[PDB]
Chains A and B, each alone.
With several copies, the nearest count.
Chain A
């Protein structure tokens, strides 16, 4: 019966070598005596390499190992909304069982050229520095990259939390469901994240998938694919999803552990040769599908942690090459009160204006031009007095705008609240306001606009475009404020 049932030859470090199993499929699951599960990654002329999803203490030499006939799959459906699930869809929140519309394989093939449609609709983060300078679209892949403790999870979570204004809506075309994949994180961090999402009522549209540090390395390697397969249900059923990976560097570390203990030869930085193929067939499963295939979308926000700010490292070098853009977070900006600490010069989007709200585009163009001028002159920032008139003016406006882009944590903004502010900044009104009062400005101005000029916000929201009849009234309404301020 060796075709169905093999014997363990050797076991250790989470890797078992099984004799027999002549018919086993690559990446198929095996069930050991004592019930521990494993994934058959290596098929060799006379033995099979199983990576154990659990503690190796249970497996002993001589163990009978029986094949399942099942490539690893996870449950999918809407009943997962509001739940915390492990890398295989098992509930770990204790609220009870999952109800699933079906099951989907982990490593399904991404959609091809033909069924896609171009990214043309926005993933509204509510962060000024993103929506106005590095827009994210539905169907995009944006890498949140930065050193430790720089603001990445904050960006992803503000993006999650800002969807509350649409997801309570009835128009299913605007609401965006969320999936958060915690790879390598400790369980207490997920506890705090679920607390934040519960406080804000965001759990009802969020699925959390948790391959925590204590989880076996195979499950940390596998969790992103299963979370992707969970989001792909919303994609394939005409719904919209945002999958955040926090973070893919640790999936790479787990894949390295697996590979090295399987005695595969290492490449650069001790990583395996095919880590690019690991992340690539993960990320570009994100797609924007055409009406023929249900108009659905899946948006990916992979996090990467850069040691010493070095983007020359192997996994950053790979993932920067797979993604459509990058939000670069830097600590020198954090400690200067620029929070979120987005380096507008290193950050880029390859989808660009197409993904942007039209009203915000109409001003982000000039915003970007002026901040580029500032990035050029900034070396001379401190000795502002002795410079030329034009350089002094550029320094002034750029510093006021950089201060303008900051905003508090867990306080996302609507685009109706972003447009007036970026307008007042671009069109020079803020030049007379001391750099310290800009925080008092954006708070006291919106409160004014909401009170005395509500129709401007209502039309910016409803119509989506700044009409001239409206842009002139916005100029009027900004002059009617800077005067009192």
Chain B
């Protein structure tokens, strides 16, 4: 078999030489039988003198000049199948949950070409999510890229949990989770909560697969984990014939690792320090996330904005691909409404009459008008008071507060900590429920009746039960 010898070790970069004159292809995986486990290297350059330069998928410490390296005959091959569910998989397709091997029948390369133009879906389509604020103002797209902007402190993990629950359980399907540079503590917490919520079961059926690339791992791994999970999502699409959704957390670190690997490979740094291949790398990741005749891989991507600068090349390049945004802002939990999604900074491409219908577009537009009118008058409400307002704008502020509160929702997973029972609402029951508030029918009712109620048919009942107390 094709065997080579190491010639250089500089950080995460390793050079190998193949005297036998049969060099390995780019993106192929090579193996070194280290004392601890095995060290995988991905070929990144051919440099002549039969020398190839490779990015390490694990720590390079302990390497010796003159160590053997064995070619695997192809790219990093992840396991695929229903046997991946409940397991935690690393970048190289190996179980890290200590619960034994994966007995899968097949293994699939992490590098595959996107679907052709002839295969793409011809029309947009709506993902009924069960969260009022999402499917009223910023609805999600089947087979699209959805970008979540917010930290753990604002409910990010529980939002991902409720998505996994509503889409996969009420509607039906599987799910894939991919930690690209995730904090290990958050990953343990997610695993524990998913065991608590019944998405993972050890002794029975389970319906989410976990790919974790920890922040301690070298840049070559963080740059490739996303493909590791995307390939499993694509298998469930093209070989299980079902709609799946793929969580990438966080997409910023894909570009960060790309910048590390480019700098290490000696490529001239571009703007503030990103790789020239930034747009093309993001494309070769994202454009596999699309709808095809056999199904749709949907994606919900957490996007870390460094220094709150949406003009930084990383988020700027990410935005070109995603068409729905969901901003979880501290400025909304500071006043105590969860999910804590900003109804105004959050936006969607699919909020078009040709997609959601005119009845929905009108409601959404008048909501984004009432909330914005309120957000215009706050200086006036503070320096002056609410008496100075006109009787028109006083009603607008009343209905804006009622709407701000009614966008809140108790999650079916918050039943444990908040105690609140948790409910999900259909798009009709939400559009019509807000139409009734804007039409002023329920202006008789106090704001508190809107606070944690899944639909107006229950706001009436809460009002009655509060007045009876």
Residues of chain A touching chain B, judged by Cβ–Cβ distance below 8 Å, are: 8-14, 17, 22-27, 42-45, 55-62, 71, 84, 92-94, 107, 109-114, 116-119, 139, 148-149, 184-188, 190-192, 195, 210, 212-214, 216-217, 250, 253-254, 256-257, 260-261, 263-270, 272-274, 276-277, 280-281, 284-285, 287-288, 307-308, 311-312, 314, 317, 320-322, 324, 331-332, 335-337, 348-350, 352, 368-369, 372, 377, 380, 382-391, 409
Contacts and interface: CB of A to CB of B under 8 A. Distances in A.
B216 A110 contact: yes
A261 B63 contact: no
Interface in B221-280: 252-253, 256, 259-260, 262-273, 276-277, 279-280
Given A93-B117, A113-B212, A277-B218, A188 B8 contact: no
29 contacts: A12-B45, A13-B45, A44-B10, A57-B27, A60-B26, A92-B117, A94-B118, A110-B214, A113-B184, A116-B184, A119-B185, A191-B122, A213-B280, A214-B114, A260-B268, A261-B277, A266-B268, A267-B269, A273-B259, A274-B219, A276-B256, A284-B184, A321-B306, A324-B185, A337-B369, A350-B152, A350-B186, A380-B383, A382-B390
Contacts of A268: 269, 272-273
A308 B184 contact: no
B389 interface: yes
Nearest to A48: B65
A386 B382 CA distance: 10
A10 B284 contact: no
Interface stretch (B54-62, B164-172, B400-408, B448-456): B54-62
Given A26-B61, A191-B122, A335-B371, A260 B270 contact: yes
B279 A186 contact: no
B26 A336 contact: no
Interface of B: 7-12, 15, 21, 23, 25-27, 44-48, 50, 53, 59-66, 88, 96-98, 111, 113-118, 120-122, 151-153, 183-189, 191-192, 212, 214-216, 218-219, 252-253, 256, 259-260, 262-273, 276-277, 279-280, 282-284, 286-287, 290-291, 304, 306-307, 309, 311, 316, 319-321, 323, 325, 330, 334-336, 344, 347, 349, 352, 365, 368-369, 371-373, 376-377, 380-385, 388-390, 393
B284 A265 contact: no
Contact of B309 (A188, A267, A312, A348): A312
Given A12-B265, A118-B188, 12 more contacts: A12-B46, A13-B267, A23-B66, A25-B62, A25-B64, A61-B23, A94-B118, A107-B59, A213-B282, A261-B267, A265-B263, A383-B390
The 5 closest A-B pairs by CB, nearest first: A12-B45, A273-B263, A213-B283, A268-B273, A372-B334
Given A213-B286, A382-B393, A280 B320 contact: no
B8 A44 contact: yes
A352 to B, nearest CB: 6
Contacts of A10: 45-48
Contacts of B219: 273-274, 276-277
A260 B287 contact: no
Contacts of B265: 12-13
Contact of B377 (A62, A260, A382): A382
A106 B142 CA distance: 40
Contacts of A92: 116-118
B183 A308 contact: no
Given A213-B280, A216-B280, A336-B373, A384 B390 contact: yes
A322 B215 contact: yes
Nearest to B333: A372
B413 to A, nearest CB: 16
A10 B266 CA distance: 13
Contacts of A94: 117-118
A196 to B, nearest CB: 10
A251 B343 CA distance: 31
B120 A188 contact: yes
Contacts of A380: 382-383
Contacts of A257: 270, 276-277, 279-280
Given A10-B48, A43-B65, A260 B267 contact: yes
Given A10-B45, A149-B347, A372-B335, A187 B65 contact: no
A25 B63 CA distance: 5
Contacts of B191: 113
Nearest to B354: A410
Contacts of B115: 187
Contacts of B256: 276
B304 A184 contact: no
A26 B117 contact: no
Contacts of A84: 117
Contacts of B66: 22-23
A1 to B, nearest CB: 16
B350 to A, nearest CB: 11
B316 A307 contact: yes
B225 to A, nearest CB: 13
Given A191-B117, A369-B334, A337 B122 contact: no
Nearest to A314: B273
A380 B383 CA distance: 8
B187 A113 contact: yes
Contacts of B25: 57-58, 60
A210 B117 contact: yes
B215 A13 contact: no
B279 A391 contact: no
A110 B266 CA distance: 29
A391 B252 CA distance: 40
Nearest to A217: B280
B38 to A, nearest CB: 15
B310 to A, nearest CB: 8
Contact of A352 (B153, B291, B388): B153
Contact of A110 (B184, B253, B259, B352): B184
B48 A214 contact: no
A23 B26 contact: no
A433 to B, nearest CB: 17
Contacts of B369: 335-337
Most chain B CB atoms below 10 A, which of A94, A216, A312, A321: A321
